Design a protein around this ligand. Structure first.
Ligand SMILES: [Ca+2]
Length: 251
């Protein structure tokens, strides 16, 4: 599957040591919603070595129970939220990763339309200003906080000729998500968006011109804590890592 998409157009193999490459990755740190992130999530995102670093051939994003204040808003956890500086329309995205094992964590590999104009993102109003969900969202990988034996694929959008919020997706079983690398992938073209875990299709959504999946998207990588899909965080939580061996994007 996906063999049609054979021209490498963006990648990071994480074979340097230090901060994520600033030519490739933008950090989000400003909260979008009056001091907070969406979905009742409990973290701040920062650009510090506490929450992200590259070593030993892999990127780590690390969530920590840590009191942290940004512009008068205090939260009890810190993490990182990266966006690719690369925006692209159609392609095959492959991310090979190990997911956090701890309860309360909500890792994601996902895209937003580049016209999202989300506060503090890399693209601003360059492509437009289509407030979510009108910019479109593809969730290549999520896990919730309470079931680490399943992965999520999902889509969120509004049709171009409607304000009605649509969302749907699937899930699939996963073994040893935290201790074994798996490859989370998207194959996206004008016909369809297909999300896979290794070779297993998790969900395929037919595309059409009435969707927001025919204009540029960028990639996001993060760990949220708590909130809708993180759920309850044990009192004893200290920290956890989402470890990414590489991101590759083909067209
Ligand atoms: Ca690597």
């Amino acid at each position: 599957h996906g063999s049609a998409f054979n021209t490498l157009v963006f990648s990071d193999e994480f074979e340097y040591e230090g901060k994520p490459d600033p030519e490739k990755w933008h950090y989000q740190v400003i909260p979008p919603n009056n001091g907070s992130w969406h979905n009742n999530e409990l973290q701040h995102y920062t650009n510090r070595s506490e929450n992200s670093f590259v070593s030993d051939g892999t990127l780590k994003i690390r969530a920590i129970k840590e009191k942290y204040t940004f512009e008068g808003s205090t939260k009890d956890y810190t993490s990182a939220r990266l966006n690719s500086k690369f925006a692209f329309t159609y392609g095959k995205v492959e991310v090979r990763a190990k997911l956090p094992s701890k309860k309360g964590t909500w890792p994601a590999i996902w895209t937003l339309g580049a016209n999202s104009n989300e506060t503090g993102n890399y693209f601003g109003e360059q492509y437009g200003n289509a407030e979510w969900p009108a910019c479109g969202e593809i969730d290549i990988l999520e896990q919730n906080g309470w079931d680490k034996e399943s992965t999520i694929a999902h889509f969120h959008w509004s049709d171009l000729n409607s304000d009605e919020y649509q969302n749907l997706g699937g899930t699939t079983p996963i073994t040893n998500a935290s201790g074994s690398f798996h490859v989370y992938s998207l194959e996206w073209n004008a016909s369809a968006m297909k999300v896979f875990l290794d070779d297993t299709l998790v969900y395929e959504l037919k595309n059409s011109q009435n969707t927001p999946y025919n204009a540029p998207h960028y990639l996001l990588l993060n760990i949220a804590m708590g909130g809708t899909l993180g759920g309850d965080i044990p009192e004893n939580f200290t920290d956890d890592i989402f470890e990414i061996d590489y991101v590759r994007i083909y067209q």
